Design a protein around this nucleic acid. Sequence first.
RNA 1: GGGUCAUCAGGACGAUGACCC
RNA 2: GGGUCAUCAGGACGAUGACCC
Lengths: 59, 59
Amino acid sequence: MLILTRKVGESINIGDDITITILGVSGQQVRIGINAPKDVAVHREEIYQRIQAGLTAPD
Amino acid sequence: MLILTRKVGESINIGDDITITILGVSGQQVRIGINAPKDVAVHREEIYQRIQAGLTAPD
RNA sequence: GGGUCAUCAGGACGAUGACCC
RNA sequence: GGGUCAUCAGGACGAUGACCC
């Protein structure tokens, strides 16, 4: 893992083709954004487990 | 962009080799984690501009 | 013991300071 | 107009509800 801190309204980068932006907070909830090509995919870690089961194109 | 809400202590996924975790919250500040192979890079958006300058090979 | 704010930083659920009770 | 809490979700700085002044 690589851990660090950010402030609401700022960003982070990954894989030189992906970007992340902490849009703001709401208590224990945090609104966040992601920016990547459709050449890759993004989901909550639960929704991901419904996909990595053997596919990349659900119903 | 793909926007979401995740609570402190949960995770998200990107591509097929990257994972993210919202480690906690501290007001306008947030602590976040990333998990990917060293075959890819991760940095603050501020540090990123020192790396995309023409080398993609930090100090 | 609890709450709140901020800073430095790296592949580590990172590290540190400050303020209030 | 301001603050606080919560839920659903898609490639959109997403959408909605609730509580307090």
